[PDB]
């Protein structure tokens, strides 16, 4: 049936998947709308699927490593079903990219440069990391996958590359690291016993606590700057800070949810900004 | 099965005839060569040498001299042939070259050869090593060259030059490992059986030289995609 495999399609998702895949694309289209003044419904869905596919295909690379020790829904899983699904997802991504090229007005050399170089550039340096150093090599993927999704989404809409869409996507890049780090924190003893190495294990219990707070409270300082100096509309993400204090006190469902609220208010901040009130637009 | 046999044949062929192939290679390179912003370079040259030293200090752990001596001799000739080609297609480019040089695959094939027990067995070990490390390296050298190669069509001048050095690095790096290196590693061990890496390596080798399938399948799709990007950008457009 379809449901028994719909329960298999959750295998390529992580708790930070929404924040890494879909929030950037939504921000990028908002930037494109705020900058140029015309937005396309079709290209938004294409970008949304093209990014998720490449994300999911990358998550299965990590999923395959969980057959090493026996770390691995309610069915008997074999290492063929992972390979078949990763291949399918990545092919879906490339087909979406081809349709985006045909519909949009972006030059093919640049679309390839971003899509194959940036989004799909992860696959080049993973495969050799091993099941121990996955979580450690994942910080590097999340730092770069966030801003490039925003640029990819922006470029496909407008028709040329820019530089500011990377700068606007720092808060969303940090908020995702907060989720990954908070997830790595609670699995410290298990990963240490199994022989796995993460950042939270390397730095220790208290430096993890300092890093978590840094990653949590930087976005609010960036929005505090942008609010008062650039546009009063962009203070809307600061309505979540009582939740951030509660999270700092209780120390990742709550963190993952905070990111969703922050991302939503950030996009609604960019849309509601006055004309020519934001830098470089 | 079909490719492994082919790379086996190549490995054995090169391993059997060292002196002729190395002369031919060097002669070809002689016939090629003799025929006719600071901050960015600083940070790149600071990180590159650290990466090289990390890899050397990783190799240091094995506790043998010949592996270092062989890994050293691969680097020199790869750096030399790159210098030939980069001169022919034109000091400052080495920071990007030393990032793309692959000493792990150079060390691996040497470790296969060092686990031998007799002068006849060394060649067969090189062939067996070549069969495992041939396809895996060819696919990486294909993908990385196409991926860096897409940046040479972008428009930005710094990027168009930085990517060109990368392409010519990867190709010149691959060609050496395929032609010159197996003969060299054969000849060094030929002219010299005091190489103990059997009991440790003979278990881990056939498990280690296996990448992730989910990566290796995606690389073929990426390869097949980039070929269309290139083919469409050059001829049709």
């Amino acid at each position: 049936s379809w449901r028994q495999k719909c329960a298999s399609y959750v295998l390529a998702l992580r708790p930070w998947s929404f924040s890494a895949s879909l929030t950037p694309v939504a921000l990028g289209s908002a930037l494109a709308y705020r900058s140029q003044g015309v937005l396309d419904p079709r290209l938004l869905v294409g970008c949304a699927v093209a990014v998720l596919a490449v994300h999911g295909a990358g998550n299965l690379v990590s999923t395959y490593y969980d057959f090493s020790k026996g770390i691995d829904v309610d069915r008997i899983l074999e290492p063929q079903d992972v390979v078949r699904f990763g291949v399918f997802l990545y092919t879906l991504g490339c087909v979406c990219a081809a349709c985006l090229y045909y519909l949009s007005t972006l030059k093919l050399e640049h679309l390839a440069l971003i899509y194959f170089g940036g989004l799909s550039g992860s696959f080049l340096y993973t495969g050799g990391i091993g099941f121990k150093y996955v979580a450690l090599g994942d910080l590097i993927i999340l730092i770069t996958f966030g801003p490039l999704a925003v640029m990819f989404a922006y470029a496909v809409q407008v028709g040329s590359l820019a530089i500011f869409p990377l700068v606007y996507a720092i808060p969303l890049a940090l908020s995702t690291e907060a989720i990954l780090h908070s997830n790595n924190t609670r699995d410290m003893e298990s990963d240490q016993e199994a022989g796995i190495v993460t950042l939270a294990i390397l730095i220790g219990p208290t430096f993890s606590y300092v890093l978590y707070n840094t990653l949590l409270f930087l976005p609010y300082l960036i929005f505090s700057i942008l609010a008062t100096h650039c546009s009063i509309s962009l203070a809307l993400p600061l309505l979540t800070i009582p939740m951030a204090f509660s999270l700092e006190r209780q120390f990742p469902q709550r963190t993952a949810k905070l990111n969703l609220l922050l991302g939503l208010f950030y996009v609604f901040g960019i849309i509601l900004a006055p004309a020519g009130s934001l830098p470089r637009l | 099965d079909k490719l492994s046999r082919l790379f086996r044949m190549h490995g054995l062929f090169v391993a059997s005839h060292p002196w002729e192939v190395i002369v031919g290679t060097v002669t070809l390179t002689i016939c090629m060569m003799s025929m006719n912003d600071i901050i960015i370079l600083t940070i790149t040259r600071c990180i590159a040498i650290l990466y090289i030293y990390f890899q050397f200090q990783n190799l240091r752990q094995l506790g043998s001299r010949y592996i270092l001596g062989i890994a050293g001799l691969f680097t020199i000739f790869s750096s030399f042939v790159f210098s030939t080609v980069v001169i022919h297609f034109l000091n400052e480019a080495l920071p990007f070259f030393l990032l793309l040089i692959d000493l792990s695959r150079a060390s691996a094939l040497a470790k296969f050869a060092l686990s031998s027990n007799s002068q006849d067995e060394v060649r067969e070990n090189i062939a067996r090593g070549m069969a495992i490390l041939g396809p895996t390296f060819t696919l990486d050298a294909l993908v990385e060259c196409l991926v860096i190669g897409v940046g040479t069509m972008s428009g930005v001048r710094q990027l168009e030059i930085m990517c060109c050095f990368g392409c010519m690095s990867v190709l010149a790096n691959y060609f050496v490992f395929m032609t010159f290196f197996p003969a060299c590693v054969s000849l060094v061990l030929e002219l010299s059986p005091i190489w103990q890496l059997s009991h440790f390596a003979r278990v881990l080798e056939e498990e280690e030289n296996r990448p992730n399938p989910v990566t290796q399948r995606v690389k073929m799709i990426m390869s097949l995609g980039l070929v269309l990007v290139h083919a469409h950008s050059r001829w049709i457009a």
Epitope: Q4, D74, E78, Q80 | -
Partner: antibody, heavy 118, light 106 residues
Amino acid sequence: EVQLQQSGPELVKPGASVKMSCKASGYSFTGYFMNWVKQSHGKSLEWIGRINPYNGDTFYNQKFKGKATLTVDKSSRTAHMELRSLTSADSALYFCVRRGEDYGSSYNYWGQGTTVTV
Amino acid sequence: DILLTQSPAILSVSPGERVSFSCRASQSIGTSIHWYQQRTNGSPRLVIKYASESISGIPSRFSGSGSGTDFTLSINSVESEDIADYYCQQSNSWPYTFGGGTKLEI
């Protein structure tokens, strides 16, 4: 049509070691796991372990951790199991068994039984 | 080790009448059970997977039921080809453990 051809009966002495081959033919050998089941006298099936043929990443049952070590031969499509330090209790049939073709299937393809005798 | 149990040890039947077994688990194992049929001098041959889903190639008389802890396999009309031993296996947690075995009789 997948079949898992298996080795013939083996007579041995106490303290020896034995090796059994399960020549898996009819599919992509490195795609699926290769499990092992022991049917002792009295008709009680017990799960020994599994092996990933691609890597060789084994994963045993805690009861059979010491005296059963699985290896693989990727060249000839053959999965092995080595029983060490045998006793009178280890006289049993041993099956090799892998999962169904598609997702959400249980163990359809079994071997034939290597009648080990101590 | 999720210990499984089974309740006639030897079941005496007649040809035509309905029969039922009972693979009652120790823990809650969801809907993960598998019923194998082993004849004389043969291998186990899968009949029902995950307690209800029939296998293509098996006669339609084999029908599984139940969930949670108690599971039941039932045959409606036994023939000469149903006289065998029936084991149940859980594939929920590792190691996978089989039942005891329920033998048929005329």
